[PDB]
Amino acid sequence: DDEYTKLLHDGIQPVAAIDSNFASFTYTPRSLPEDDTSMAILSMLQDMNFINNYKIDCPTLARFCLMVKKGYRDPPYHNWMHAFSVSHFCYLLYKNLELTNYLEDIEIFALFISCMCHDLDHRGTNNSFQVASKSVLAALYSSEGSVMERHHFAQAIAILNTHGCNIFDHFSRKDYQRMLDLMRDIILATDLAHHLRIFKDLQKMAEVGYDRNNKQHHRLLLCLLMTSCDLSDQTKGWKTTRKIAELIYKEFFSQGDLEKAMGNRPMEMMDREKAYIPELQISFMEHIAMPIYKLLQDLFPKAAELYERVASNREHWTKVSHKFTIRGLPSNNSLDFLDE
Amino acid sequence: IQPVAAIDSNFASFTYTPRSLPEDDTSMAILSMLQDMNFINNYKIDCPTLARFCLMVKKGYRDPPYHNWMHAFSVSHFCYLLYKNLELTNYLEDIEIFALFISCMCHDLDHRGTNNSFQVASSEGSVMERHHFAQAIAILNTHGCNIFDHFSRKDYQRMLDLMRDIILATDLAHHLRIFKDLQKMAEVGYDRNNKQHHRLLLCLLMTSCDLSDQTKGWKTTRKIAELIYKEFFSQGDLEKAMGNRPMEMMDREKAYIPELQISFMEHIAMPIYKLLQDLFPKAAELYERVASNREHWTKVSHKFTIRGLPSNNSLDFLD
Ligand SMILES: CC[C@@H](NC(=O)c1cnn2cc(C)cnc12)c1ccc(OC(F)(F)F)cc1
Ligand SMILES: CC[C@@H](NC(=O)c1cnn2cc(C)cnc12)c1ccc(OC(F)(F)F)cc1
Ligand SMILES: [Mg+2]
Ligand SMILES: [Mg+2]
Ligand SMILES: [Mg+2]
Ligand SMILES: [Zn+2]
Ligand SMILES: [Zn+2]
């Protein structure tokens, strides 16, 4: 309502007016103030021509975007600024890798909307913690798997069914179902478990080459692209990867604290007393992040700089590892911690 | 003068931690120990003079983190424990044991929280130890403070010579020089008729007093390390500001505590208490407690790696 008037009266702006480096892989979406993000979303959709392509009612689109933004909570990492930055990287893939030569317009459109919606109502805890804590989400989704991802999707649907927020209510019956299916598949691809299951399929597709006439390749690419966006904080500079590490480990240790308080022993990366950040970071870089961008590189030669930045950032984590060794007294001037 | 048992039932025991005794009761405790060893009656020490001397000594210490009155007091208390537990009268003359106790009180007088190397950056070594002794002489030459003012000319000079020697023995370099001679003495067995054996033993006893914090439990050794590193790094900070490269162990950004604690424990502290055990079977529990503390230090060495986020929540220190 208040933010609605602000957003609407701003008007859909050319992507250049935001920043000259906006469509570049070097640009950091987190540099943009949060109060400008909703306009940037609209700008990106305009630049990809999805507004005119699908004749989306602009006030409906404004309301949708504000609702999505409002649909995020404020944990250290999984907040709107994460969804925004993920969305931005999806836009970057479109502009830089020329996705129109690989996927249907409806698929790219679904990828971008999914990115906006992919962590809706995230509470800063993983799928595991929902079960352990016996949350409502576990009650709802634990037997199906990908607990959080199913909630994110359910939240996205609820937004669409909010009056004045249905950006697809003018879509053909065929296109409408397609969009819903695509959003579900893409959002569920954000579960690491899913990525790990389809990993060998992705390796096959990258080696043999992407075949645009292969409907399975479309599915797999959409998944790979979604995971690339989700992890894109690893493709920027040192400052970004380091700041993000702060937010992610903050979130992780908060969850770990809650697991100790209810009896459970949290995994190493959730435990603030046992977690060695350099080691956990490097292991994640080398074994999760880097292969995703290696696969992307093999499918799109223009993605090579992304893999190189993740590799460079991983080397930087090795370089600064030694600093986690307490020299002198701790920044406390006490040794009381030697009796834990 | 309060009897020793009235201070604490465990006051004469090796398990007693003299740092647990309130600083306001320490002067009084000094007089009690001297009373219990019977040096007051033995040497006809004037009590008011002794009272004033003790307060001048107490006042003669500055307030660095480690080298303050409480260090001197705890050192002096350990000398009393050696007397009470090992029966030093089998090895040493009464005047030598008396000199040792007074030397313990005086051995770090006017310490500034800096080492001999700080004085370098007058070059025959042991600069601070020499200063500590001069300060002891200056206190004795203070009106109403000379506890030996009634001694014979021979006994006076004897007492001063002993104090100088014992105080000079607190320098690590001195200890390392005489170490072979200490080992030989322990090897052949103590000879009471051997003047050189008396001199060497006094040096050993003093160093064992000086390092006595390592002979208690974990709490003491951990707390003392804090105080010592606090002191060492403040000197490092000062040397950096004045425009000099401090030694690695004085630099809070270079120094690794576990590697330094253990090296000190096993290479310096433990061989001293081993030699003490060799000469005094009853000192066996002391070496064991040092070895145990040395073992505990290796146990907690892993904690000097940052797990989770640092004190705050920022990885700002990485950039
Ligand atoms: C918070 C979940 C998120 N993790 C990160 O972004 C992350 C960054 N540094 N980091 C370091 C550690 C130790 C662990 N996680 C991270 C994530 C999201 C999707 C996903 O699945 C996909 F890989 F397929 F995308 C895998 C992980
Ligand atoms: C401050 C000097 C004092 N050191 C300690 O008490 C001490 C305790 N922990 N610690 C850890 C390190 C790394 C270094 N020093 C210490 C000392 C005094 C006399 C002496 O000479 C003697 F060995 F002969 F006694 C040698 C050292
Ligand atoms: Mg997610
Ligand atoms: Mg190939
Ligand atoms: Mg000294
Ligand atoms: Zn995400
Ligand atoms: Zn001392």
XYZ file of C-alpha atoms and ligand atoms in Angstrom:
718
model
C 0.000 0.000 0.000
C 2.594 2.542 1.173
C 5.415 0.739 -0.649
C 3.006 0.002 -3.512
C 2.608 3.700 -4.401
C 6.395 4.167 -4.114
C 7.116 1.210 -6.421
C 4.406 1.975 -8.982
C 5.264 5.686 -9.269
C 8.941 4.828 -9.833
C 8.053 3.208 -13.182
C 9.836 0.364 -14.995
C 13.340 1.651 -15.658
C 16.007 0.735 -18.246
C 18.642 -1.544 -16.700
C 21.334 1.095 -17.434
C 19.698 3.632 -15.082
C 20.371 1.286 -12.135
C 24.069 0.818 -12.939
C 26.203 0.692 -16.100
C 27.791 -2.571 -14.913
C 24.432 -4.180 -14.007
C 24.435 -6.906 -16.700
C 28.044 -7.917 -15.908
C 29.291 -10.966 -13.975
C 31.509 -8.598 -11.930
C 28.523 -6.671 -10.531
C 27.532 -7.414 -6.935
C 23.718 -7.189 -6.522
C 24.184 -6.730 -2.751
C 25.725 -3.309 -3.427
C 22.232 -2.140 -4.414
C 20.171 -0.742 -1.494
C 17.238 -2.926 -0.395
C 14.760 -0.096 -1.106
C 15.755 -0.266 -4.801
C 15.516 -4.067 -5.234
C 11.810 -4.271 -6.158
C 12.295 -1.779 -8.989
C 15.387 -3.703 -10.143
C 13.258 -6.878 -10.354
C 10.764 -5.080 -12.635
C 13.635 -3.605 -14.646
C 15.105 -7.077 -15.164
C 11.783 -8.579 -16.274
C 11.353 -5.640 -18.668
C 14.856 -6.105 -20.056
C 14.173 -9.801 -20.704
C 10.909 -8.656 -22.335
C 8.731 -10.948 -20.227
C 6.290 -8.136 -19.437
C 5.469 -7.411 -23.096
C 5.954 -11.051 -24.170
C 3.345 -12.402 -21.749
C 1.369 -9.131 -21.416
C 1.616 -9.071 -17.621
C -0.472 -6.385 -15.941
C 2.150 -4.074 -14.400
C 0.242 -3.181 -11.189
C -0.336 -6.931 -10.646
C 3.393 -7.464 -11.212
C 4.252 -4.691 -8.745
C 2.006 -6.228 -6.069
C 3.430 -9.703 -6.752
C 7.023 -8.482 -6.329
C 6.205 -6.654 -3.087
C 4.420 -9.723 -1.734
C 7.386 -11.963 -2.594
C 9.768 -9.495 -0.918
C 7.492 -9.357 2.158
C 7.370 -13.181 2.132
C 10.971 -13.415 3.301
C 11.936 -13.310 6.966
C 15.209 -11.838 8.238
C 17.698 -14.551 9.198
C 21.384 -13.649 8.564
C 21.530 -15.325 5.122
C 18.152 -16.548 3.817
C 16.475 -13.141 3.551
C 15.126 -11.131 0.589
C 18.624 -9.918 -0.339
C 19.586 -13.535 -1.019
C 16.510 -14.080 -3.232
C 17.225 -10.777 -4.992
C 20.896 -11.608 -5.647
C 19.921 -15.095 -6.896
C 17.343 -13.471 -9.213
C 19.987 -11.039 -10.448
C 22.367 -13.872 -11.321
C 19.571 -15.580 -13.276
C 19.269 -12.339 -15.229
C 23.063 -12.403 -15.690
C 22.909 -15.919 -17.145
C 20.188 -14.787 -19.561
C 22.229 -11.795 -20.786
C 25.673 -13.401 -20.779
C 25.076 -17.042 -21.785
C 22.221 -16.193 -24.203
C 19.701 -18.599 -22.655
C 17.119 -17.954 -25.418
C 19.266 -20.200 -27.637
C 18.828 -23.112 -25.205
C 15.460 -22.863 -23.428
C 11.838 -21.916 -24.127
C 10.738 -18.387 -23.186
C 8.338 -19.906 -20.642
C 11.188 -21.875 -19.030
C 13.479 -18.846 -18.604
C 10.516 -16.864 -17.271
C 9.769 -19.662 -14.776
C 13.461 -19.783 -13.809
C 13.482 -16.088 -12.895
C 10.217 -16.141 -10.947
C 11.438 -19.295 -9.177
C 14.664 -17.516 -8.159
C 12.571 -14.747 -6.578
C 10.445 -17.286 -4.726
C 12.941 -20.084 -4.065
C 13.605 -19.434 -0.337
C 10.232 -17.890 0.652
C 9.563 -17.902 4.414
C 12.948 -19.488 5.170
C 13.575 -19.567 8.930
C 17.366 -19.923 8.770
C 17.311 -23.666 9.406
C 17.873 -26.641 7.077
C 15.547 -29.537 6.189
C 17.037 -31.659 8.989
C 16.162 -29.154 11.706
C 12.482 -29.088 10.671
C 12.195 -32.807 11.432
C 14.264 -32.664 14.651
C 12.223 -29.721 15.948
C 8.958 -31.344 14.767
C 7.869 -28.154 13.008
C 4.559 -27.789 11.135
C 6.580 -27.932 7.900
C 7.936 -31.367 8.847
C 4.393 -32.499 9.682
C 3.342 -31.274 6.218
C 6.323 -32.316 4.078
C 8.699 -34.700 5.922
C 7.283 -37.834 4.270
C 7.734 -36.228 0.831
C 11.310 -34.968 1.349
C 12.763 -31.514 0.567
C 10.752 -30.025 3.454
C 11.756 -26.364 3.078
C 11.659 -26.442 -0.732
C 8.070 -27.700 -0.682
C 7.163 -24.898 1.720
C 8.824 -22.257 -0.501
C 6.723 -23.523 -3.432
C 3.541 -23.626 -1.334
C 4.273 -20.033 -0.280
C 4.777 -18.966 -3.929
C 1.403 -20.512 -4.828
C -0.318 -18.783 -1.881
C 1.050 -15.444 -3.137
C -0.301 -16.093 -6.649
C -3.715 -16.880 -5.139
C -3.680 -13.643 -3.148
C -6.142 -11.203 -4.729
C -4.467 -8.791 -7.155
C -1.219 -10.798 -7.195
C -1.805 -13.408 -9.899
C 0.682 -12.530 -12.651
C -0.456 -15.566 -14.685
C -4.266 -15.120 -14.419
C -4.320 -14.059 -18.087
C -2.114 -16.979 -19.224
C -3.623 -19.710 -21.372
C -4.771 -22.797 -19.455
C -1.869 -24.722 -21.050
C 0.730 -22.055 -20.193
C -0.628 -21.686 -16.642
C -0.151 -25.374 -15.772
C 3.275 -25.365 -17.436
C 4.340 -22.405 -15.268
C 3.189 -24.109 -12.047
C 4.971 -27.352 -12.968
C 8.148 -25.477 -13.900
C 8.162 -23.466 -10.667
C 7.745 -26.636 -8.583
C 10.522 -28.530 -10.403
C 12.926 -25.572 -10.338
C 12.306 -24.733 -6.656
C 12.759 -28.402 -5.659
C 16.062 -28.385 -7.570
C 17.343 -26.014 -4.836
C 17.613 -28.968 -2.423
C 21.242 -30.143 -2.307
C 19.952 -33.734 -2.018
C 18.244 -33.358 -5.412
C 21.362 -31.868 -7.032
C 23.414 -34.814 -5.776
C 20.902 -37.326 -7.189
C 20.927 -35.771 -10.681
C 24.667 -35.029 -10.671
C 25.654 -37.933 -12.965
C 22.878 -36.987 -15.407
C 24.312 -33.457 -15.430
C 27.809 -34.866 -16.047
C 26.468 -36.900 -18.968
C 24.646 -33.910 -20.528
C 27.681 -31.617 -20.209
C 29.965 -34.175 -21.852
C 27.650 -35.104 -24.758
C 26.563 -31.482 -25.227
C 23.199 -29.796 -24.707
C 20.563 -30.909 -27.224
C 17.798 -28.293 -27.522
C 15.414 -30.930 -28.952
C 15.884 -33.070 -25.822
C 13.137 -32.368 -23.259
C 15.143 -34.079 -20.499
C 18.085 -31.756 -21.215
C 15.722 -28.790 -20.686
C 14.808 -30.139 -17.224
C 18.434 -30.832 -16.279
C 19.704 -27.457 -17.498
C 16.970 -25.633 -15.555
C 18.096 -27.505 -12.424
C 21.792 -26.776 -13.000
C 21.090 -23.099 -13.751
C 18.952 -22.807 -10.580
C 21.722 -24.248 -8.389
C 24.262 -21.928 -10.095
C 22.114 -18.923 -9.132
C 21.607 -20.163 -5.577
C 25.370 -20.430 -4.998
C 26.339 -17.352 -7.003
C 27.813 -15.513 -3.987
C 30.847 -17.750 -4.618
C 31.395 -16.290 -8.118
C 32.041 -12.693 -7.026
C 35.106 -11.169 -5.325
C 36.733 -11.980 -1.986
C 34.709 -9.386 -0.054
C 31.415 -11.020 -1.107
C 32.380 -14.667 -0.400
C 33.764 -13.594 2.990
C 30.732 -11.501 4.016
C 28.421 -14.312 2.901
C 30.442 -16.818 4.939
C 29.746 -14.600 7.970
C 25.993 -14.702 7.317
C 25.839 -18.439 6.519
C 27.948 -19.549 9.485
C 25.980 -17.180 11.743
C 22.800 -18.913 10.591
C 24.361 -22.393 10.891
C 25.574 -21.856 14.474
C 22.199 -20.409 15.530
C 20.620 -23.685 14.382
C 23.358 -25.686 16.136
C 22.635 -23.838 19.391
C 18.963 -24.850 19.151
C 19.928 -28.490 18.497
C 22.097 -28.598 21.644
C 19.242 -27.013 23.633
C 16.850 -29.816 22.635
C 19.317 -32.670 23.214
C 20.663 -33.422 19.732
C 24.303 -33.208 18.677
C 24.480 -30.950 15.600
C 26.611 -31.721 12.549
C 30.151 -30.282 12.609
C 29.290 -27.232 10.452
C 26.392 -26.325 12.776
C 28.525 -26.629 15.935
C 30.215 -23.339 16.912
C 32.609 -25.187 19.276
C 33.880 -27.724 16.713
C 33.446 -25.998 13.318
C 36.667 -25.070 11.549
C 35.491 -22.518 8.960
C 38.504 -22.711 6.595
C 38.080 -26.480 6.246
C 34.286 -26.391 5.885
C 34.466 -23.554 3.332
C 37.119 -25.275 1.199
C 35.264 -28.614 1.277
C 32.051 -26.896 0.171
C 33.911 -24.949 -2.547
C 35.777 -27.946 -4.003
C 33.027 -30.564 -3.742
C 29.714 -28.688 -4.187
C 30.176 -25.204 -5.672
C 33.132 -25.768 -8.052
C 31.614 -28.817 -9.811
C 28.373 -26.877 -10.461
C 30.347 -24.111 -12.204
C 32.552 -26.687 -13.945
C 29.446 -28.272 -15.453
C 28.142 -24.824 -16.419
C 31.534 -24.037 -18.011
C 31.398 -27.249 -20.071
C 27.943 -26.298 -21.390
C 28.674 -22.581 -21.836
C 32.264 -21.506 -22.657
C 31.258 -17.948 -21.633
C 30.737 -19.255 -18.064
C 34.473 -20.002 -17.680
C 35.143 -16.840 -15.646
C 32.542 -18.004 -13.089
C 34.361 -21.276 -12.382
C 37.683 -19.384 -12.259
C 36.360 -16.951 -9.649
C 35.078 -19.801 -7.457
C 38.464 -21.526 -7.823
C 40.238 -18.245 -6.984
C 38.023 -17.708 -3.927
C 38.762 -21.284 -2.799
C 42.515 -20.566 -3.022
C 41.975 -17.387 -1.011
C 40.350 -19.463 1.757
C 43.504 -21.625 1.784
C 45.686 -18.484 1.885
C 43.941 -16.952 4.942
C 43.484 -20.289 6.781
C 46.496 -19.670 9.049
C 44.747 -16.661 10.641
C 42.322 -18.955 12.504
C 45.301 -19.799 14.718
C 45.149 -17.784 17.956
C 48.341 -15.738 18.142
C 49.088 -14.172 21.522
C 46.140 -13.964 23.887
C 42.633 -13.992 22.412
C 40.869 -10.658 21.795
C 39.698 -10.935 25.406
C 43.003 -11.100 27.356
C 41.790 -14.223 29.159
C 42.726 -17.913 29.068
C 39.568 -18.987 30.943
C 38.501 -20.790 27.745
C 41.174 -23.452 28.424
C 38.747 -25.036 30.903
C 36.121 -24.807 28.102
C 52.427 -12.438 65.144
C 49.823 -15.057 64.241
C 50.719 -18.777 64.379
C 50.840 -20.476 60.949
C 47.928 -22.876 61.634
C 45.630 -19.892 62.313
C 46.163 -18.604 58.754
C 45.186 -21.925 57.178
C 45.312 -25.584 58.232
C 47.043 -26.411 54.929
C 49.441 -23.413 54.978
C 52.580 -25.560 55.338
C 51.519 -27.978 52.570
C 52.715 -28.191 48.944
C 49.061 -28.213 47.824
C 48.510 -24.735 49.295
C 48.174 -21.877 46.803
C 49.543 -18.708 48.509
C 47.783 -16.549 45.890
C 44.461 -17.564 47.503
C 45.515 -15.539 50.555
C 44.235 -11.903 50.378
C 46.969 -9.354 49.600
C 46.151 -7.508 52.857
C 47.137 -10.588 54.886
C 50.442 -11.241 53.078
C 52.716 -8.994 55.164
C 51.376 -10.607 58.335
C 51.907 -14.047 56.753
C 55.586 -13.217 56.097
C 56.132 -12.578 59.818
C 54.324 -15.825 60.664
C 56.596 -17.877 58.384
C 59.725 -16.230 59.804
C 58.361 -16.946 63.294
C 57.653 -20.579 62.418
C 61.192 -21.062 61.047
C 62.358 -19.414 64.303
C 64.592 -16.846 62.555
C 63.274 -13.989 64.723
C 64.510 -15.600 67.982
C 67.575 -17.134 66.282
C 68.908 -13.826 64.935
C 67.361 -11.521 67.564
C 65.494 -9.634 64.841
C 63.731 -6.503 66.070
C 60.033 -7.055 65.246
C 59.141 -3.395 64.513
C 62.176 -3.209 62.195
C 61.050 -6.457 60.521
C 57.491 -5.111 60.207
C 58.783 -1.924 58.543
C 61.203 -3.862 56.319
C 58.411 -6.136 55.053
C 56.220 -3.155 54.182
C 59.079 -1.388 52.367
C 59.698 -4.546 50.320
C 55.971 -4.949 49.559
C 55.873 -1.274 48.537
C 59.076 -1.735 46.496
C 57.209 -3.789 43.913
C 55.453 -2.066 41.009
C 52.198 -3.425 39.551
C 52.902 -5.277 36.282
C 50.626 -8.274 35.551
C 53.082 -10.890 36.874
C 56.116 -9.340 38.596
C 54.278 -7.747 41.513
C 54.236 -8.292 45.285
C 52.028 -11.384 44.973
C 54.715 -13.111 42.891
C 57.359 -12.323 45.543
C 55.013 -13.439 48.307
C 54.206 -16.762 46.609
C 57.929 -17.310 45.936
C 58.734 -16.595 49.610
C 55.916 -18.911 50.655
C 57.431 -21.731 48.597
C 60.807 -21.212 50.294
C 58.980 -21.769 53.584
C 57.455 -24.974 52.161
C 60.914 -26.219 51.208
C 62.040 -25.539 54.775
C 58.962 -27.211 56.294
C 58.819 -30.218 53.963
C 62.370 -31.099 52.885
C 64.285 -30.394 56.130
C 66.871 -28.063 54.600
C 68.800 -27.863 57.893
C 70.371 -31.207 56.905
C 71.937 -29.444 53.912
C 72.285 -25.763 54.777
C 73.408 -23.479 57.601
C 70.699 -21.450 59.370
C 72.110 -18.207 57.915
C 71.880 -19.633 54.378
C 68.219 -20.604 54.749
C 67.485 -17.208 56.308
C 69.253 -15.448 53.412
C 67.242 -17.521 50.933
C 63.902 -16.429 52.419
C 64.777 -12.724 52.500
C 66.153 -13.051 48.938
C 62.820 -14.526 47.778
C 61.015 -11.456 49.155
C 63.457 -9.122 47.425
C 64.357 -11.030 44.262
C 62.221 -9.066 41.752
C 62.118 -5.654 43.490
C 61.201 -2.697 41.250
C 60.420 -4.990 38.315
C 58.929 -2.976 35.442
C 57.269 -5.766 33.459
C 60.246 -5.819 31.071
C 63.158 -8.284 30.743
C 66.969 -7.951 30.542
C 66.847 -7.810 26.728
C 64.741 -4.620 27.041
C 67.586 -2.986 29.002
C 70.004 -3.990 26.207
C 67.966 -2.508 23.329
C 76.192 -3.003 32.530
C 76.609 -5.655 29.801
C 77.859 -8.575 31.916
C 74.324 -10.000 31.940
C 71.767 -10.230 34.763
C 70.999 -6.482 34.599
C 67.566 -6.663 36.275
C 68.700 -9.174 38.910
C 71.561 -6.787 39.762
C 69.015 -3.968 39.987
C 66.758 -6.087 42.220
C 69.662 -6.584 44.651
C 70.640 -2.904 44.710
C 67.003 -2.138 45.623
C 67.230 -4.630 48.519
C 70.392 -2.865 49.761
C 68.643 0.514 49.388
C 65.784 -0.708 51.620
C 68.180 -1.996 54.290
C 69.985 1.366 54.239
C 66.612 3.021 54.922
C 66.337 4.340 58.480
C 64.439 1.894 60.705
C 64.418 -0.867 58.069
C 67.768 -2.664 58.478
C 66.865 -6.043 59.975
C 70.581 -6.953 60.110
C 71.700 -3.705 61.804
C 72.767 -5.652 64.906
C 74.705 -8.404 63.049
C 78.472 -8.672 63.421
C 80.649 -7.191 60.663
C 81.330 -10.733 59.400
C 77.694 -11.859 59.543
C 76.493 -8.651 57.886
C 78.784 -9.025 54.875
C 78.055 -12.777 54.785
C 74.299 -12.042 54.649
C 74.697 -9.482 51.860
C 76.979 -11.796 49.846
C 74.435 -14.611 50.111
C 71.577 -12.338 49.010
C 73.476 -11.052 45.979
C 74.367 -14.623 44.935
C 70.863 -16.009 45.471
C 69.245 -13.031 43.685
C 71.750 -13.349 40.793
C 70.765 -17.027 40.552
C 67.249 -15.967 39.439
C 68.643 -15.077 35.988
C 68.003 -17.884 33.506
C 71.498 -17.465 32.005
C 73.059 -18.038 35.447
C 70.989 -21.209 35.878
C 72.015 -22.619 32.487
C 75.697 -21.920 33.226
C 75.626 -23.819 36.540
C 73.317 -26.598 35.309
C 76.181 -29.056 34.681
C 77.563 -28.340 38.166
C 74.054 -28.928 39.589
C 73.799 -32.258 37.746
C 77.231 -33.405 38.951
C 76.278 -32.542 42.558
C 73.006 -34.491 42.239
C 74.910 -37.358 40.584
C 77.659 -37.754 43.233
C 75.302 -36.917 46.124
C 75.201 -33.852 48.382
C 78.241 -33.219 50.576
C 77.516 -30.952 53.539
C 81.233 -30.217 54.079
C 81.518 -28.996 50.482
C 81.174 -25.190 50.362
C 80.495 -25.329 46.617
C 77.577 -27.714 47.194
C 75.950 -25.177 49.553
C 76.295 -22.429 46.937
C 74.863 -24.591 44.149
C 71.913 -25.852 46.199
C 70.968 -22.294 47.184
C 70.870 -21.408 43.482
C 68.677 -24.442 42.727
C 66.280 -23.767 45.606
C 65.881 -20.139 44.507
C 64.994 -21.054 40.909
C 62.539 -23.671 42.226
C 60.937 -20.975 44.385
C 60.869 -18.559 41.441
C 59.008 -21.090 39.262
C 56.818 -22.546 42.038
C 53.527 -21.567 40.328
C 54.090 -24.534 37.991
C 54.013 -26.940 40.962
C 50.363 -26.345 41.854
C 47.210 -27.360 39.966
C 45.920 -26.417 36.522
C 44.182 -23.262 37.781
C 47.454 -21.680 38.979
C 49.583 -22.519 35.905
C 46.812 -21.296 33.561
C 46.276 -18.042 35.517
C 50.045 -17.391 35.742
C 50.472 -17.921 31.981
C 47.810 -15.239 31.392
C 49.719 -12.823 33.629
C 53.080 -13.669 32.052
C 51.914 -13.371 28.436
C 50.009 -10.185 29.305
C 53.338 -8.859 30.604
C 55.432 -10.154 27.686
C 53.172 -8.706 24.998
C 52.918 -5.295 26.703
C 56.716 -5.139 26.447
C 56.338 -6.183 22.789
C 53.810 -3.398 22.177
C 56.175 -0.896 23.846
C 59.185 -2.017 21.764
C 57.105 -1.720 18.568
C 56.051 1.835 19.491
C 59.610 2.956 20.310
C 60.765 1.582 16.940
C 62.288 -1.852 17.489
C 61.448 -5.408 16.448
C 60.448 -7.275 19.621
C 61.432 -10.920 20.063
C 58.970 -13.444 18.632
C 57.725 -14.526 22.074
C 57.040 -10.884 22.998
C 55.013 -10.186 19.833
C 51.289 -10.852 20.375
C 50.852 -11.261 16.606
C 53.679 -13.792 16.245
C 53.751 -15.632 19.589
C 52.072 -19.024 19.821
C 51.297 -19.712 23.498
C 51.094 -23.548 23.404
C 54.501 -23.868 21.716
C 55.983 -21.402 24.234
C 54.319 -22.789 27.392
C 55.352 -26.375 26.624
C 58.912 -25.418 25.634
C 59.248 -23.555 28.942
C 57.595 -26.373 30.937
C 59.752 -29.207 29.611
C 63.078 -27.512 28.845
C 63.323 -25.109 31.812
C 60.842 -25.751 34.652
C 60.844 -29.581 34.644
C 64.642 -30.157 34.728
C 64.794 -27.852 37.788
C 62.188 -29.920 39.637
C 63.818 -33.133 38.425
C 67.136 -32.047 40.001
C 65.237 -31.090 43.160
C 63.673 -34.568 43.254
C 67.146 -36.146 42.874
C 68.464 -34.287 45.937
C 65.197 -34.430 47.891
C 63.053 -37.575 47.511
C 60.240 -35.724 49.333
C 60.160 -33.223 46.434
C 58.905 -35.989 44.095
C 55.293 -34.750 44.183
C 56.489 -31.348 42.922
C 58.062 -32.699 39.722
C 54.941 -34.826 39.150
C 52.636 -31.792 39.408
C 54.844 -29.912 36.916
C 54.797 -32.918 34.552
C 50.978 -33.113 34.935
C 50.548 -29.403 34.182
C 52.886 -29.875 31.208
C 50.610 -32.740 30.088
C 47.473 -30.628 30.595
C 48.988 -27.863 28.442
C 49.417 -30.289 25.517
C 45.783 -31.341 26.009
C 44.418 -27.802 25.576
C 46.774 -26.823 22.719
C 43.998 -27.460 20.165
C 41.840 -24.698 21.709
C 44.233 -22.099 20.241
C 42.448 -22.571 16.917
C 39.309 -20.510 16.291
C 36.197 -22.662 16.078
C 33.044 -20.976 14.811
C 33.052 -17.193 14.569
C 35.484 -15.132 16.684
C 34.508 -13.243 19.877
C 31.976 -11.169 17.903
C 30.392 -12.456 14.663
C 32.644 -10.888 12.029
C 35.310 -12.355 9.762
C 36.700 -8.814 9.556
C 40.101 -10.019 10.800
C 40.602 -12.034 7.584
C 40.788 -8.964 5.325
C 22.796 -22.598 3.100
C 22.541 -23.549 1.955
C 23.361 -23.195 0.727
N 24.767 -23.173 1.046
C 25.554 -22.134 0.626
O 25.197 -21.264 -0.155
C 26.879 -22.136 1.190
C 27.900 -21.177 0.974
N 29.017 -21.466 1.643
N 28.706 -22.607 2.276
C 29.651 -23.196 3.076
C 29.046 -24.389 3.684
C 29.896 -25.163 4.618
C 27.800 -24.800 3.423
N 26.980 -24.192 2.622
C 27.438 -23.059 2.046
C 23.051 -24.193 -0.343
C 21.964 -23.999 -1.170
C 21.665 -24.916 -2.153
C 22.467 -26.028 -2.305
O 22.163 -26.955 -3.285
C 22.927 -26.694 -4.459
F 24.269 -26.776 -4.261
F 22.572 -27.638 -5.364
F 22.649 -25.475 -4.981
C 23.551 -26.239 -1.483
C 23.837 -25.314 -0.505
C 59.205 -14.236 33.683
C 60.462 -15.039 33.903
C 60.180 -16.326 34.649
N 59.350 -17.181 33.841
C 58.254 -17.819 34.361
O 58.004 -17.954 35.548
C 57.380 -18.353 33.357
C 56.159 -19.043 33.545
N 55.600 -19.400 32.388
N 56.469 -18.938 31.475
C 56.209 -19.138 30.146
C 57.332 -18.596 29.373
C 57.270 -18.763 27.903
C 58.374 -17.962 29.925
N 58.519 -17.780 31.202
C 57.556 -18.299 31.994
C 61.518 -16.931 34.933
C 62.148 -16.658 36.129
C 63.386 -17.196 36.404
C 63.993 -18.012 35.475
O 65.247 -18.532 35.760
C 65.153 -19.869 36.227
F 64.705 -20.717 35.265
F 66.410 -20.250 36.553
F 64.363 -19.966 37.329
C 63.379 -18.287 34.272
C 62.140 -17.744 34.008
Mg 16.716 -22.905 -0.129
Mg 32.022 -33.230 -24.902
Mg 63.457 -12.040 38.180
Zn 18.668 -20.026 -1.765
Zn 60.674 -13.925 40.135
